Amino acid sequence: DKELIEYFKSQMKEDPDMASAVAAIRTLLEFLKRTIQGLRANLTSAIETLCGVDSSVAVSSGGELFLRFISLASKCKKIMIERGELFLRRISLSRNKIADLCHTFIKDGATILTHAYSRVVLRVLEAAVAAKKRFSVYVTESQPDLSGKKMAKALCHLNVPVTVVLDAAVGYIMEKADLVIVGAEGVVENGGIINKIGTNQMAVCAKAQNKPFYVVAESFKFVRLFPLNQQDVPDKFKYKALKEEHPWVDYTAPSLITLLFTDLGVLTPSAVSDELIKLY
Amino acid sequence: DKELIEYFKSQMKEDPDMASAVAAIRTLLEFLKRIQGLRANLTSAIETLCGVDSSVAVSSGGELFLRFISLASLEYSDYSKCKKIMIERGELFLRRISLSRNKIADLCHTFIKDGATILTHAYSRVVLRVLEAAVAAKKRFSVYVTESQPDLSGKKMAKALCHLNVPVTVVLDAAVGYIMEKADLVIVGAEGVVENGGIINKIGTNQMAVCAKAQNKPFYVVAESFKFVRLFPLNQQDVPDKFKYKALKEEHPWVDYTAPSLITLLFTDLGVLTPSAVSDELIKLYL
Amino acid sequence: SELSERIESFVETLKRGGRSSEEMARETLGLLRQIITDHRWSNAGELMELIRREGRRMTAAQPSETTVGNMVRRVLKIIREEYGRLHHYAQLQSNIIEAINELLVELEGTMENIAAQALEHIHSNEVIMTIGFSRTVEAFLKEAARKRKFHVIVAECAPFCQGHEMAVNLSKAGIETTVMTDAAIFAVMSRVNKVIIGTKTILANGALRAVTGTHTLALAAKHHSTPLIVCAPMFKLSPQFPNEEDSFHKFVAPEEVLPFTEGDILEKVSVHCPVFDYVPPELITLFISNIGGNAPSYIYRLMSELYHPDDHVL
Ligand SMILES: O=P(O)(O)OC[C@H]1O[C@](O)(CO)[C@@H](O)[C@@H]1O
Ligand SMILES: O=P(O)(O)OC[C@H]1O[C@](O)(CO)[C@@H](O)[C@@H]1O
């Protein structure tokens, strides 16, 4: 109950490249290793405490799928841990599938524009330079955590011309961008995405100039929310935990998104919804 | 030639509320106090003054003064009589733009509804005056201001606007598209108004406007008469590198061009203007 | 053998370009039916490798002719679904054949089922504007012309003026037609009530690769908010997304655009002449299929029940 939080923090510690939701799944499944009737009640408390320490959408989404990817099977605890281990085996290969689908969408000599920092966009570009494509990356230093500089330092090792553009200068450099690639922190039920603050005005500018806005999310980031504006995003997700507002996420409408390169194949935004309807 | 720069810096020092272009006007007018080679001296003053500030307003505000005095030389020619008609006409020009912000405030504060919630960019001594006149007319509203990296002028504005007892929020620079639905209208102060009626303001004004037209929020610009520059950009590259730059690689432009389709109205000195109307006025300010 | 020589005959005809799209799909089905009959294969795996290899060479012959690739993928889906329901199976060689025959009668009725929905989308005193010469759209406009009376503007496609024979075909059936010059699409767009076009290929996101004027057409249709109907059957439905790695453009000789008699300036001028033009799905209103009239945003689902996701890349 308390060892769960420190074990989740550990699963952050020995690998930061592993996603937050995947860390939640790993600590959740290791909690499942330790009556099995109504065990959803035990795991729901684990989900609530795990979303307490991490405010991200993916932790309360990917953990929700594991609450029901084990509950689609309905002793049964052994088939539960077997199917859960299969679930973990098939989300360790998400970023590779996304990279394989998405690096073919980057033309040679292109000039992409990305946002804050994401292990998926970084992997898309890592696979694109491994396919002997050459391009340049514009990354916005996203306030307040400055993870644009972290991405550009993590992407300069790939020998890519990367430019840490200002957070305000998206509308300036949007015309110098062939395509926009962002990593979603959660994909809501209408096909839009919930991503680090500033993704929305990246999209709104991009559609103002008809630049394709590509999103590279994963399968476990499919959350059941249906926002209609930036109000409808819950305060659980926006606020991470001289007056200042300071959210950390904002909703991007599905009309602004050209394609999603999720784990389960390339989707139009309209193709997201039944991929949530199927999981129900 | 060097004391010119020192005097311009002094006019910055003992007057921070005075605009950069007005400081250029004052120091250039004193340089005028010290035939047709004098026009060349004033052009050199333009070059040296724009070389140390590089704002659009300085190279436009001083450039109208190269024309507001040379218009009188079209009427008559002399050697020292022309210099004195120059100084009594330049003093009129200079005292006719000391009243600019008040006129803009009187025109624009009637466009803020009671209980509104405006959104503004970095720091404008004109937007601040529009809101100062709007609270002096017993209107109450909310102000959202972006902190507007790299110099954090939004925090300076919100510190300069909290004394007015207005609920002001220093929103993050990335979060314009988030709070944009929480905004009834957008008021920005242009650093220069180009020939198509669009504006050149601090970086991030463009995506404030593009979000605005995405939600049909009115985007109001409060510029002044001397900020009417003769440029005609077609994209963000067409803005000169004189104006964009004040000096894992950083880019940092400091200004960007806002298209005139994104602007609802301009509250300039010389009346409320449609973005088309600006072009006429520019013709009238250069024949 | 007869079959092998017919395979390279088909491949070389594809390369040189020597027929309509429905005939292309029918000949592809006949060829693939022959491949699965006359070759010897133990189980379905070897035959899927064989079909995949031959589809790879027919696709690499003319990559912009995707009807043959689509029908290779449809046969592959049929193979893996008629082997799934039996899971070396003796009757499998028969079973696929019957499904292929059920595909070949799904074909030769594609144009009738698209033409049946003509009256639901064309009204009296309408003005319709089309671009190329597609047999699907002319049957659509000639089934609506039996009952109602309307105007059709056939904007010719400039390099190969092929809207000329379309407007000759339509004027013989009594539709009052207008031939345009392809520069006037934005001009006459104000009058036009619906735009009904055909495609070479419907890509997997609802976008379509069509005759070279259709994007310049769709932009005008979106500007005037004219609905852009697309009449295209399910062999023209290809599971490829518009990626930059694969080239979807086809470029033909510049003699179609700038003739060889120009002379010395031809050593300096770079003439291109593409024949296909990408139309993004947000400029489309409907796809009148042979199974209905569903929206572009449904096309992904039509992929999942036509082609297996392992068969996308061959
Ligand atoms: O690293 P991930 O899992 O791709 O997260 C994607 C998004 O989540 C963030 O890292 C935090 O919001 C964003 O910077 C990023 O866009
Ligand atoms: O109103 P001011 O102080 O004359 O300047 C207006 C604009 O110029 C800047 O001060 C610098 O670009 C911006 O902060 C402001 O938007």
Side-chain angles (χ1 to χ4, degrees), chain A residues 1-35 37-39 41-47 49-79 81 83-106 109-188 190-280, chain B residues 1-38 40-73 77 79-85 87-112 115-194 196-247 249-286, chain C residues 1-4 6-101 103-105 107 109-111 113-244 247-314:
Chain A
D1 299 331
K2 180 67 174 66
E3 89 280 358
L4 180 135
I5 299 296
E6 59 89 19
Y7 179 46
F8 172 80
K9 292 299 296 300
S10 84
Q11 295 287 68
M12 293 324 198
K13 294 298 186 295
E14 293 83 4
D15 54 354
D17 198 78
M18 182 179 72
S20 289
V22 189
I25 301 309
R26 292 231 198 159
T27 182
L28 200 71
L29 184 47
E30 212 280 333
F31 170 76
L32 189 150
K33 303 184 169 105
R34 296 181 178 93
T35 312
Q37 294 82 17
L39 190 62
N42 296 115
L43 273 298
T44 305
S45 67
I47 295 299
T49 55
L50 270 186
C51 192
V53 65
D54 202 357
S55 298
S56 68
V57 180
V59 168
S60 69
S61 168
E64 164 168 271
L65 280 72
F66 201 83
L67 190 141
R68 86 172 299 143
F69 192 77
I70 301 299
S71 291
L72 283 175
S74 298
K75 50 172 72 66
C76 190
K77 189 184 287 183
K78 300 289 94 176
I79 190 167
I81 198 154
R83 195 173 181 179
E85 274 165 355
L86 164 74
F87 188 71
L88 276 174
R89 283 187 233 115
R90 293 189 299 173
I91 62 170
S92 307
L93 322 172
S94 303
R95 294 172 183 174
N96 296 321
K97 292 185 178 69
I98 295 147
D100 296 355
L101 303 167
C102 192
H103 81 277
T104 69
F105 276 75
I106 298 165
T111 184
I112 69 167
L113 166 52
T114 183
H115 205 244
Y117 170 67
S118 58
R119 275 69 49 92
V120 191
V121 176
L122 181 135
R123 236 273 143 206
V124 161
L125 304 178
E126 181 157 343
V129 305
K132 306 306 188 295
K133 279 158 203 272
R134 61 184 182 179
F135 46 82
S136 51
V137 176
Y138 284 117
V139 54
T140 71
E141 61 86 20
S142 68
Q143 306 284 341
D145 50 355
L146 267 293
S147 55
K149 286 172 184 182
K150 168 161 77 164
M151 189 184 209
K153 286 176 226 162
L155 191 150
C156 187
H157 307 301
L158 274 61
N159 189 359
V160 183
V162 64
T163 298
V164 190
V165 70
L166 213 47
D167 206 1
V170 165
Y172 179 104
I173 62 153
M174 185 63 72
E175 66 190 11
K176 309 160 60 181
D178 284 5
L179 72 164
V180 183
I181 304 189
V182 298
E185 200 176 0
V187 178
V188 291
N190 47 348
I193 60 151
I194 289 190
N195 190 12
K196 181 71 175 295
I197 183 64
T199 292
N200 185 275
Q201 66 182 359
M202 186 161 291
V204 173
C205 289
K207 201 179 198 59
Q209 303 173 359
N210 307 116
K211 311 300 191 213
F213 186 93
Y214 296 128
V215 169
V216 288
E218 311 177 56
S219 85
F220 50 81
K221 273 159 182 175
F222 281 10
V223 74
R224 274 90 181 139
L225 275 65
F226 205 104
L228 308 154
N229 46 4
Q230 326 296 319
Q231 296 294 141
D232 285 339
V233 192
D235 292 332
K236 294 187 287 184
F237 304 146
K238 293 193 287 185
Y239 301 106
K240 189 177 292 295
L242 288 173
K243 184 171 71 70
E244 280 144 352
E245 182 66 26
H246 290 214
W248 281 78
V249 302
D250 54 356
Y251 162 79
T252 305
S255 55
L256 314 175
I257 293 181
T258 296
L259 279 185
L260 283 77
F261 298 99
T262 74
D263 196 358
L264 61 83
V266 186
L267 319 172
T268 59
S270 65
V272 169
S273 312
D274 56 352
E275 306 293 330
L276 276 159
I277 279 182
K278 289 178 176 66
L279 282 71
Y280 279 122
Chain B
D1 299 331
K2 180 67 174 66
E3 90 280 359
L4 180 137
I5 298 295
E6 297 175 351
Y7 184 31
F8 176 79
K9 264 72 176 174
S10 85
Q11 298 263 25
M12 295 296 172
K13 295 298 185 295
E14 293 83 3
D15 217 330
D17 188 75
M18 182 179 72
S20 289
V22 190
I25 297 286
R26 292 187 186 274
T27 184
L28 190 152
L29 190 52
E30 167 75 31
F31 173 73
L32 183 63
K33 286 185 283 186
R34 297 170 168 160
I35 301 96
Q36 295 297 109
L38 187 63
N41 296 115
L42 294 174
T43 303
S44 67
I46 296 297
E47 294 294 328
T48 56
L49 274 177
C50 176
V52 298
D53 194 349
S54 81
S55 81
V56 191
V58 165
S59 72
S60 170
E63 203 265 341
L64 282 72
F65 200 78
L66 188 151
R67 207 180 200 278
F68 192 80
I69 301 299
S70 296
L71 266 173
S73 178
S77 57
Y79 61 97
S80 183
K81 184 264 289 180
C82 182
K83 201 179 288 171
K84 64 90 176 179
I85 192 168
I87 192 66
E88 283 70 341
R89 197 178 171 97
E91 283 173 353
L92 171 63
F93 177 80
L94 183 46
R95 79 163 53 99
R96 215 167 67 195
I97 61 171
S98 308
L99 320 173
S100 284
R101 280 161 188 177
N102 307 326
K103 193 163 310 183
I104 293 147
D106 295 0
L107 298 174
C108 188
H109 92 276
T110 75
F111 275 76
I112 298 165
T117 183
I118 69 167
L119 170 51
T120 175
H121 205 263
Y123 171 69
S124 290
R125 296 172 293 275
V126 190
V127 177
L128 189 152
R129 243 264 134 215
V130 161
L131 303 178
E132 180 155 348
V135 307
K138 306 306 189 295
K139 297 179 172 75
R140 51 153 157 84
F141 44 80
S142 309
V143 172
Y144 284 118
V145 55
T146 65
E147 53 173 62
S148 174
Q149 309 264 22
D151 48 356
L152 277 300
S153 281
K155 286 165 177 188
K156 167 161 78 166
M157 191 184 208
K159 281 176 235 162
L161 191 150
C162 187
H163 307 302
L164 278 65
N165 189 359
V166 183
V168 61
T169 298
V170 193
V171 70
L172 197 57
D173 206 5
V176 166
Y178 176 100
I179 63 169
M180 186 57 164
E181 64 200 15
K182 296 180 186 62
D184 290 2
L185 72 164
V186 188
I187 307 189
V188 296
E191 210 179 1
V193 181
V194 290
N196 47 344
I199 61 151
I200 290 182
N201 201 35
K202 189 182 275 183
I203 185 67
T205 289
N206 184 275
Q207 65 182 358
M208 191 165 282
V210 173
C211 291
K213 206 177 201 60
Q215 300 170 358
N216 310 116
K217 311 300 191 212
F219 186 92
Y220 296 127
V221 169
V222 288
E224 311 178 55
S225 85
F226 50 81
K227 272 159 182 175
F228 281 3
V229 75
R230 192 59 178 163
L231 267 46
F232 205 102
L234 305 156
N235 41 59
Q236 322 297 319
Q237 294 82 17
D238 273 340
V239 191
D241 291 331
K242 295 187 288 184
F243 305 144
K244 287 199 283 189
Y245 303 97
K246 298 290 183 287
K249 58 178 180 290
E250 298 289 335
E251 189 176 6
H252 294 88
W254 279 79
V255 303
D256 55 356
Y257 161 80
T258 304
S261 54
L262 313 176
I263 293 181
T264 296
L265 279 185
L266 284 78
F267 298 99
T268 67
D269 185 74
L270 60 83
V272 185
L273 295 187
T274 313
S276 51
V278 172
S279 181
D280 294 10
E281 306 295 327
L282 266 169
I283 282 165
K284 294 180 182 179
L285 266 61
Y286 310 76
Chain C
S1 67
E2 200 267 338
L3 187 153
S4 300
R6 184 177 182 270
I7 291 189
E8 291 84 4
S9 178
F10 188 55
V11 168
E12 288 271 13
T13 303
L14 266 182
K15 291 170 81 70
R16 300 189 187 101
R19 68 180 70 246
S20 80
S21 62
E22 189 171 3
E23 301 208 337
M24 185 64 73
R26 186 180 40 83
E27 291 293 80
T28 305
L29 265 296
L31 180 61
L32 263 70
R33 184 179 67 189
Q34 273 201 318
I35 288 173
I36 76 161
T37 51
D38 292 331
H39 293 89
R40 297 285 75 78
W41 48 277
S42 70
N43 65 84
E46 299 94 3
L47 188 151
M48 293 177 70
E49 304 314 286
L50 182 63
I51 289 291
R52 211 176 288 253
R53 151 172 59 251
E54 305 270 33
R56 259 191 289 252
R57 65 179 293 166
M58 293 176 275
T59 301
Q62 182 69 259
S64 197
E65 185 88 29
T66 44
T67 310
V68 59
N70 295 354
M71 296 279 96
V72 164
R73 291 164 190 134
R74 285 291 308 273
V75 173
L76 279 171
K77 167 98 191 156
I78 275 167
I79 293 158
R80 78 162 79 243
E81 85 180 6
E82 296 271 331
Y83 158 84
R85 77 181 50 179
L86 270 70
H87 212 56
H88 186 273
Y89 296 148
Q91 57 263 39
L92 175 65
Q93 188 274 331
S94 163
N95 279 25
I96 306 162
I97 285 300
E98 294 295 327
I100 289 172
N101 294 2
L103 189 42
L104 269 179
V105 308
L107 262 67
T110 55
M111 199 151 88
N113 303 342
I114 293 163
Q117 320 158 47
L119 277 297
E120 318 169 22
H121 296 91
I122 282 162
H123 310 118
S124 285
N125 268 7
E126 204 84 22
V127 54
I128 309 281
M129 182 178 71
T130 177
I131 180 68
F133 168 61
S134 66
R135 274 82 168 174
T136 299
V137 168
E138 69 173 359
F140 194 89
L141 299 187
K142 275 151 73 157
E143 193 91 6
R146 285 178 171 85
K147 280 73 176 175
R148 304 202 177 106
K149 187 173 177 65
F150 50 94
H151 192 46
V152 160
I153 308 168
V154 188
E156 72 192 30
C157 45
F160 311 79
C161 299
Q162 203 174 5
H164 287 167
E165 82 166 305
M166 173 60 148
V168 164
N169 271 20
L170 283 175
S171 86
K172 284 166 174 187
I175 301 103
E176 55 183 1
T177 52
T178 304
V179 190
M180 272 170 68
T181 187
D182 212 312
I185 286 174
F186 198 65
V188 310
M189 206 63 217
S190 67
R191 317 162 47 200
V192 167
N193 287 130
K194 289 178 187 290
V195 177
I196 299 181
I197 72 180
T199 54
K200 183 74 174 183
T201 293
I202 303 164
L203 302 167
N205 64 324
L208 54 89
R209 176 180 60 231
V211 181
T212 183
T214 56
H215 189 194
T216 318
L217 181 62
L219 286 169
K222 194 59 188 294
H223 188 257
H224 289 101
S225 200
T226 298
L228 170 66
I229 317 290
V230 168
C231 296
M234 294 297 102
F235 48 83
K236 293 185 173 170
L237 196 69
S238 87
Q240 295 298 109
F241 274 96
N243 44 5
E244 296 290 327
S247 285
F248 76 104
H249 271 298
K250 188 173 84 175
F251 290 91
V252 290
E255 162 68 50
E256 307 292 328
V257 165
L258 201 54
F260 198 83
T261 64
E262 287 307 301
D264 43 0
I265 77 168
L266 284 181
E267 84 182 310
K268 303 294 179 191
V269 176
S270 187
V271 191
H272 282 305
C273 194
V275 286
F276 288 133
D277 207 25
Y278 180 76
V279 184
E282 69 274 15
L283 316 174
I284 320 295
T285 295
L286 290 188
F287 290 164
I288 298 196
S289 310
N290 47 356
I291 64 170
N294 46 8
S297 61
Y298 195 49
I299 286 304
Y300 76 99
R301 181 52 199 176
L302 300 185
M303 296 297 172
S304 307
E305 58 194 8
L306 281 192
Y307 320 107
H308 197 266
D310 286 344
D311 295 339
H312 278 53
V313 59
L314 277 297

